[PDB]
């Protein structure tokens, strides 16, 4: 039916594998059997059934007992049509599984596609929580120095300083150039949309991370200065706001005549925050005076 | 809707809600602002939105 040209019998063969997945246990043919589900599936192009199937795809598995050889390849013909499917967030359970292929096969070719796709779901990853544990996985990798990016995963690493993208330009050009390491950033672009939707978003992402980043940052650094300094509009400022809002900017202090924004200076209620400020700062100023003098006074008795 | 029943209290009960929602969407996050600037991407008029919000 694949060479027939008939893709009206699709429905009917995954309609019939959910049948023939349950009532009995199958190690080897299931494994075998599965790739039907993904393989019509490309000319079908359905939102509610891949929502279906990869849901009863990934269900129940761990290790062991699979062996078709080749699963690391059909594991990258799994997630990848959930990430055409889905955006970005999706090949975060996808892309962090890829380190155990570097140790089956040879690693000559994992600079290309492992090394590659390390970096992503690390980038796509979560501000609020993952973002704190999972860059530590990829850390310690003799392999990770080797890589030219290093540098941009060490700025997007912590303590971001604010740079002009124009010197990335020619970076990325350069990484476009280069076949040497991660070379199939055409392939990666080889959608027209995509990669513009990919580059913007990614684009939005750190300009929201940076933004992130100073929030917590009591220091007031004046974002209408910055907008002169970036030198952009306004008015993807105020759309990046409208990503804000559902960023959970909902504390912030602004301004009816300028346009200088605040992160603090709450109303400050008496018995709340000054209140334990003055707390944790007489206590560990009290504490800390109790222990060097008296360290000192037991200091002084070694000249005797 | 010129031989709509009484349900159009309940319509506009509804328009009132997803006003409410609007309401509580865009000017929750300012603390102040504009009124004509957020009130641009509405692009309707600030008398009646002025009298459910002080309601």
Redesign the interface.
Known sequence: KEQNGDVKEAASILQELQVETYGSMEKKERVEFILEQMRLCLAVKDYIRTQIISKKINTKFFQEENTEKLKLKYYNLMIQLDQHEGSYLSICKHYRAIYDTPCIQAESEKWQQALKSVVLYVILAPFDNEQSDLVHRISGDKKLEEIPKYKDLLKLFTTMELMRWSTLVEDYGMELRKGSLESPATDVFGSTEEGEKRWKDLKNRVVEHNIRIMAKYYTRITMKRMAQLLDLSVDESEAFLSNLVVNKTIFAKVDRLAGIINFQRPKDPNNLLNDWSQKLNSLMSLVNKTTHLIAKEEMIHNLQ | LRDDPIISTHLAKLYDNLLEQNLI??I???????IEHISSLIKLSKADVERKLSQ
Do not use: G, H, L
């Not at chain 2, 929750?28 to 504009?34: A, D, G, H, L, N």
């Open positions: 969407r865009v929750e996050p300012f603390s102040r602002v504009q």
